[PDB]
Amino acid sequence: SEVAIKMVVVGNGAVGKSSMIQRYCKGIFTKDYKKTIGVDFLERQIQVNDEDVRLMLWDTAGEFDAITKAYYRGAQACVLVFSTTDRESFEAVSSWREKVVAEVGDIPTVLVQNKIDLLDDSCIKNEEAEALAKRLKLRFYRTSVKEDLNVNEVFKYLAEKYLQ
Ligand SMILES: Nc1nc2c(ncn2[C@@H]2O[C@H](COP(=O)(O)OP(=O)(O)O)[C@@H](O)[C@H]2O)c(=O)[nH]1
Ligand SMILES: [Mg+2]
């Protein structure tokens, strides 16, 4: 048998949420300005602690109350994403954490700074990001979906945290 885990990936527009889901589940990254997923989630079968696990990664479309409720319904873990090159996306992180708690509760959550390959154009100081993760008591990953750096670790950690 297998354990199914619904995970939500949230954050401001263009931080790389759709790309992150496509990378993890399909192993691909294209150079398009915006990535789209035409179904509610992509999935990947993995092994965690000698258990078959079906991860279902739900991608946001962009919300009205019923849309928000359907997206978060039954969510079991959360990736909170901001972008190295988008200051507003970083400043919104605390509000995203509050929003996920409001919509589903205090589910296992990880903080991800995506686009770390664009470090020369970074709008975030390393110390600021570290302080935010410490204040929110969240594990923090610096990630590049484009270069496949610290993507797999995000989902493995959340799956382990959910099962443990
Ligand atoms: N340089 C770089 N671009 C990225 C990375 N991840 C995503 N992008 C690009 O950021 C843009 C927005 O990505 P998308 O997945 O549509 O973001 P979403 O709106 O959060 O779903 C696209 O051009 C992606 O290819 C990354 O790690 N590095
Ligand atoms: Mg998207």
Side-chain angles (χ1 to χ4, degrees), residues 14 17-19 34-36 59-61:
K17 300 182 299 296
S18 301
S19 300
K34 180 177 177 59
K35 278 60 181 291
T36 58
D59 195 28
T60 68

Side-chain angles (χ1 to χ4, degrees), residues 53-62 64-87 89-110:
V53 174
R54 181 192 178 201
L55 295 192
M56 300 170 295
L57 306 186
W58 284 58
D59 195 28
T60 68
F64 297 106
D65 186 73
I67 298 285
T68 299
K69 294 285 186 64
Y71 179 75
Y72 287 103
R73 186 166 300 121
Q76 294 160 302
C78 172
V79 184
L80 208 173
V81 188
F82 68 97
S83 168
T84 293
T85 58
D86 181 342
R87 182 70 187 195
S89 78
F90 171 69
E91 296 170 356
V93 164
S94 301
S95 72
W96 282 113
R97 168 67 162 152
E98 298 290 271
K99 178 78 182 308
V100 173
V101 175
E103 298 298 331
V104 65
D106 192 9
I107 58 174
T109 297
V110 61

Side-chain angles (χ1 to χ4, degrees), residues 8 22 41 55 61 68 84 99 112-113 129:
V8 294
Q22 292 176 351
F41 60 87
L55 295 192
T68 299
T84 293
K99 178 78 182 308
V112 174
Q113 176 173 341

Side-chain angles (χ1 to χ4, degrees), residues 11-20 29-36 59-60 114-118 143-147:
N12 276 21
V15 302
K17 300 182 299 296
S18 301
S19 300
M20 185 177 298
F29 177 86
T30 63
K31 303 177 185 179
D32 304 299
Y33 89 100
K34 180 177 177 59
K35 278 60 181 291
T36 58
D59 195 28
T60 68
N114 191 35
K115 315 198 182 181
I116 205 69
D117 56 287
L118 305 179
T143 294
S144 175
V145 174
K146 172 176 184 183
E147 300 299 329

